[PDB]
Symmetry: C3
Subunit: 331 residues, 3 copies
């Protein structure tokens, strides 16, 4: 068809593959969820996706992994969390200029880290995002004259937690909110639409995302996290990603692998508090760092169990296809 229609198929496929899902329709649903959260954040993220995909075209990289949207998904998040962490409010059009420049570095980091991780056959998860956003937010900070960021400071007092003033239904609502906060959205409807976007692609990814969000939610009640942060889903968006990555995407899904995914989600949830407290000294927020660290430290695990199998990256599409391919290869 027309080249502009291919480019947008690419940006659509690159929009949804933050969830490790590759469908234009899922990307459409995710963008629609972005516009119901905040129209400014949605356009900021779409512009980041466009620039990140176009930079890969400029750098003359492989055509195959631009159609999947691999270079796309690291720009939508950059735009989204540059719009989230600004103090100039909505529709501050001067924020688009740093998005233009700083999203062009996502393909560069994706190509640099893929040369290091090629000797262990590990996927590059979001490290271009984490590096890029940490760089931008530390370079500008809260006291910048042009692009100030929200004030984020460490804790210096004992939280006052009341266990007789916790409400179960809102706590259960953190499961949709926790999955919708991977992109930065805290509206339960956005999380729900994200759930349908996952389900139409592959139900098993949706199940693993939901259980990861729950596991992250209950892993913050064990260390007395303030309720107003669990209700906003800030304690369970790394766990969702970790569970999705470990469950059936990069490991052939079995009940042992399911338990391993639960363990990885718990480990990512506990690492999230540590990376939120340590990076709070710099004034920086934890941004998908715990997911990357936990996923890479669980994908590097070795085991003599014949039923915990690490799939080669050249043949990873989605968990049901992974099962079909594995069973075909065994026979």
């Amino acid at each position: 068809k027309s080249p502009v229609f291919q480019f947008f198929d690419w940006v659509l496929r690159g929009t949804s593959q933050v969830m490790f899902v590759n469908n234009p329709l899922s990307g459409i649903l995710i963008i629609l969820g972005l516009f119901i959260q905040n129209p400014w954040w949605a356009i900021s993220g779409c512009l980041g996706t466009i620039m990140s995909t176009l930079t890969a075209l400029i750098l003359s990289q492989d055509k195959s992994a631009i159609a999947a949207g691999f270079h796309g998904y690291n720009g939508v998040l950059v735009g989204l969390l540059m719009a989230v962490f600004s103090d100039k409010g909505d529709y501050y059009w001067w924020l688009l200029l740093p998005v233009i420049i700083m999203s062009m570095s996502c393909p560069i980091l994706s190509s640099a880290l893929g040369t290091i991780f090629s000797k262990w056959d590990l996927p590059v998860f979001t490290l271009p995002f984490n590096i890029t956003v940490t760089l931008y937010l530390a370079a500008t900070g809260h006291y910048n004259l042009f692009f100030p960021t929200t004030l984020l400071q460490p804790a210096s007092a004992m939280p006052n937690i009341t266990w007789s003033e916790v409400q179960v239904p809102l706590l259960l609502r953190a499961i949709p909110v926790g999955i919708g906060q991977v992109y930065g959205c805290d509206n339960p409807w956005t999380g729900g639409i994200f759930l349908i976007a996952l389900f139409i692609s592959s139900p098993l990814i949706c199940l693993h995302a939901a259980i990861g969000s729950t596991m992250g939610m209950l892993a913050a009640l064990t260390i007395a996290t303030p309720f107003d942060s669990i209700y906003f889903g800030l304690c369970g968006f790394n766990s969702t990603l970790a569970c999705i990555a470990i469950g059936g995407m990069f490991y052939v899904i079995t009940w042992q692998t399911h338990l391993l995914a639960i363990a990885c989600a718990l480990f990512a949830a506990y690492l999230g508090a540590a990376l939120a407290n340590m990076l709070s000294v710099f004034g920086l927020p934890p941004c998908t760092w715990p997911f990357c660290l936990s996923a890479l430290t669980f994908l590097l695990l070795t085991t003599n169990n014949p039923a915990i199998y690490k799939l080669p990256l050249s043949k990873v599409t989605y968990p049901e296809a992974n099962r079909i391919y594995y069973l075909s290869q065994e026979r």
Copy 2:
């Protein structure tokens, strides 16, 4: 014999191999030293050892390096320094629950890091410990409602050092205290029993440990460290480990290698102050990080000298056996 007696032989061998020594009797002496320091810390560390060893059994890892106690030694330290850095006092039984969960990640990190370090034939020293304890302490911190940790803040004033109020004998007593503080104990008798535990295994390791402790002690007098921290052996427990690792364990011991071990101990002692000051901003203590960094940066050194030999990890037992094997191989 009975399987329960094998398991405990393993936990015994995994208790003492923090010192790179593999003997049930040395582990018995070390545990006895733990009980004379603090009975609560001793049981906390023994429980961590048991859980860390059992997790390796669950993860179906190699039998050979569970008998040596490789997966054991990263749990005793986790338990010990979780009990050391708590504000709830002795016999706070609710602290055992985080020890159960967080010690189960030591085998995972040991297997993940061994896949990265297998391409350079480098041992995994304590990085599972360092990562795990840093994670836990940063996740909970001093202001947690459930497991608060001791307050550790950086310096903001000039120490008042009086050189006419320094006592030589207590300064010399920092050599046993400095070696006993590798596990966390500050009782000179614990350090002494640790010395006998080393000596009965191999005298050369004991000699290198003692000289490393001395080198770390005198490397803090060169940068005007407060006396009350040298007297507690906090400035010479990384140096002890570095000297033990470099002297005759992973390098065939010669006088050139002995000097290299002295240099590594000095470098680790100076890195200890840096990692204590930088990690003090987070509220975290330096925990064997300087040892890991110095040992890995000295084991990666290359040299045309034919008498500085790096032993393969598959044939590293203890320095005298290393000499015997090297001389046999040359002939």
Copy 3:
């Protein structure tokens, strides 16, 4: 000739190869520029160069890459920035003792990091320097009794920038100052003499250095950097190094590679602000860290463009010779 004359040829060649240039005359000019900035800093850096080169002799390393001055250039900078960041003023001869000891670790780190980077054919740029100086400054800090360092604290207020009180000519003078601040000098004459030292070696390196300094200077006006820091060339010395490294040294110089060098200089300039703000919490200054990170992340980039060529490290001398060798190899 006489051995002492070879040693000094080596220290001369190791003095100038911070700029990736290998000439005794360029080293002479650089040392002369050091003595016009500050005679104390110059002798401090020369002593560091001598000790770093001599340590490589002690460690019995390869003769070929000691003649080039590879082990030399990491000591001059250590001495220079140990003299820059002291509070005891000029001619504090007790500062030479830490320079003696701490410069002996540059060969060790250079040999350790070259074993890690040998599997990706990446040069070790200044990481021994960065690690060593960060170690020393964090170990001593501002409140040390023996070697206190200058007070460096993060920002907590909105800078008051007046755009009607900016002067163009002094802003243009930041190009020589910005290149002279790679070594630590802020005198425009030192930067000029550095420019002639580059030009006599290879004009293209001088051109890339100048354009990198300009790019770093104008990359700080985009995020509202205070004028008194751009005027001192603190915002463009990482960019100069990054541009020199990427332009024609490690990549065969073409217009596409020239644009890539501009992009790398811009990325290093923006990373400089981030590493200055984050490392300011520790009380540490950014010291060539942004250059190392940007150069390594741009040298690990892969591309299907046939005219962006990464040269093997065994055949990298200087850009014009690189062009000649590449054209000869193609024919």
